[PDB]
């Protein structure tokens, strides 16, 4: 199949051959295959599904990043990413608490631009922790 | 550069212009690339992370 | 008499507008196949299957108008 | 008599509507090919084969219309 490398300035998050991945993108979530469309893009706050040989998924949080899928060695670069069991479902539910408090505690436009990103980080965590249960 | 616990080498290398001396990806030449919309921003911001990464490392 | 040339004219309006409808709906439909084919080339056999599923729906009414265009023309 | 003039008129509108439908239908389909070849010329041999597999079904109905326009004009006359 194809080889995926996922890195951040803090760590290498994954690297190896993979059969399929479903990945966050700029306009919406995107499905990848061997010889998929040779495309580079920015990504929204979200996650990636890593379905390996014998069909085994794992779930990686992608809080921010840029990707490349043109070569047979594909690549996600993450401005922040967290491994799917270092985060927890309880931690993301706390993330919901902060986002909803700052929505109540934001009142202008500039602070709403940060509170909207603080919400997006919580919502993307709240997404991967449910997916993590599969 | 840290080539050994007790030997290190002084080095100079060019970041810009991003050297076309480096190889073309001819093995993957069949897969010639498609931009995502807003290719200026995606390419510029990506290259800023490249030079940021090269300098910090 | 006048009866027959008006039948050849009415078959010509059904079997012409079926030619607009079956032609432009498969250009719109098959152009989206080709960009999808250029996008997921290994999936071309998977996407080609769905293209025939929907092609049967697009052709469904233009083949009623072509079956009646031949009836008005030749069988009456 | 008047019937033949209206049969030439019937074959003319039938072949004209076929000419619009078949030529705008292949100009769309082929414009999608030329963009996907522009994206990657390595798939010129591969798309240009899907192009003809699809372009057969575009020309399915307009050559019934051209086949009956030719019949009206030459054999009903």
TrEMBL record, chain A:
CDD domains, per the entry: F1-ATPase_delta
Limits of the ATP synthase F1 complex delta/epsilon subunit N-terminal domain: 3-81
Membrane topology term: Peripheral membrane protein
Molecular functions per Gene Ontology: ATP binding; proton-transporting ATP synthase activity, rotational mechanism
Keywords assigned: ATP synthesis, Cell membrane, CF(1), Hydrogen ion transport, Ion transport, Membrane, Transport
ATP synthase epsilon subunit C-terminal domain: residues covered: 86-130
SUPFAM superfamilies given in the database record: Epsilon subunit of F1F0-ATP synthase C-terminal domain, Epsilon subunit of F1F0-ATP synthase N-terminal domain
Subcellular location: Cell membrane
InterPro entries assigned to the protein according to its UniProt record, in alphabetical order: ATP_F1_dsu/esu_C_sf, ATP_synth_F1_dsu/esu, ATP_synth_F1_dsu/esu_N, ATP_synth_F1_esu_C, ATPsynth_dsu/esu_N
Highest taxon in the source lineage: Bacteria
Keyword Cell membrane set for record: yes
GO cellular component: plasma membrane; proton-transporting ATP synthase complex
Primary localization class, coarse: membrane
Functional note: Produces ATP from ADP in the presence of a proton gradient across the membrane.
Quaternary structure and partners: F-type ATPases have 2 components, CF(1) - the catalytic core - and CF(0) - the membrane proton channel. CF(1) has five subunits: alpha(3), beta(3), gamma(1), delta(1), epsilon(1). CF(0) has three main subunits: a, b and c.
NCBIfam families given in the database record: ATP_synt_epsi, PRK00571.1-4
Stated family: Belongs to the ATPase epsilon chain family.
Identification of the protein by name: ATP synthase epsilon chain
Species, as recorded: Escherichia coli O145:NM
Automatic annotation (TrEMBL), chain B:
Entry's localization field: Cell inner membrane; Cell membrane
Subunit text: F-type ATPases have 2 components, CF(1) - the catalytic core - and CF(0) - the membrane proton channel. CF(1) has five subunits: alpha(3), beta(3), gamma(1), delta(1), epsilon(1). CF(0) has three main subunits: a, b and c.
Family indicated by similarity: Belongs to the ATPase gamma chain family.
Cited function: Produces ATP from ADP in the presence of a proton gradient across the membrane. The gamma chain is believed to be important in regulating ATPase activity and the flow of protons through the CF(0) complex.
The protein, known as: ATP synthase gamma chain
Organism from which the protein derives: Escherichia coli
Classification of source organism: Bacteria, Pseudomonadati, Pseudomonadota, Gammaproteobacteria, Enterobacterales
Gene that encodes the chain: atpG
Included stretch of the parent chain: 174 to 230 of 287
């Amino acid at each position: 199949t194809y080889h995926l490398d996922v890195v951040s300035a803090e760590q290498q998050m994954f690297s190896g051959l993979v059969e399929k991945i479903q990945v966050t993108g700029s306009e919406g979530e995107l499905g990848i295959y061997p010889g998929h469309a040779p495309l580079l893009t920015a990504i929204k706050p979200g996650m990636i599904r890593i379905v390996k040989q014998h069909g085994h998924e794992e779930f990686i949080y992608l809080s921010g990043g840029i990707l490349e899928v043109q070569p047979g060695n594909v690549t996600v670069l993450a401005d922040t990413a967290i491994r799917g069991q270092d985060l927890d479902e309880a931690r993301a539910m706390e993330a919901k608490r902060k986002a909803e408090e700052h929505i109540s505690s934001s009142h202008g436009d500039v602070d709403y631009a940060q509170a909207s990103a603080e919400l997006a980080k919580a919502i993307a965590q709240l997404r991967v922790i449910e997916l993590t249960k599969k | 550069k840290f080539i050994n616990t007790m030997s290190q080498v002084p080095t100079i290398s060019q970041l810009l212009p991003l050297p076309a001396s480096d190889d073309d990806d001819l093995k993957h030449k069949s897969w010639d690339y498609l931009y995502e919309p807003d290719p200026k921003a995606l390419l510029d911001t990506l290259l800023r992370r490249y030079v940021e990464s090269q300098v910090y490392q | 008499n006048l009866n027959m040339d008006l039948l050849y004219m009415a078959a010509a309006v059904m079997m012409g507008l079926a030619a607009i409808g079956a032609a432009i709906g498969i250009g719109i439909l098959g152009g989206k196949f080709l960009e999808g084919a250029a996008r997921q080339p290994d999936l071309i056999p998977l996407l080609r299957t769905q293209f025939f599923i929907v092609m049967g729906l697009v052709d469904a009414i233009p083949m009623i108008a072509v079956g009646l265009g031949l009836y008005v023309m030749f069988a009456v």
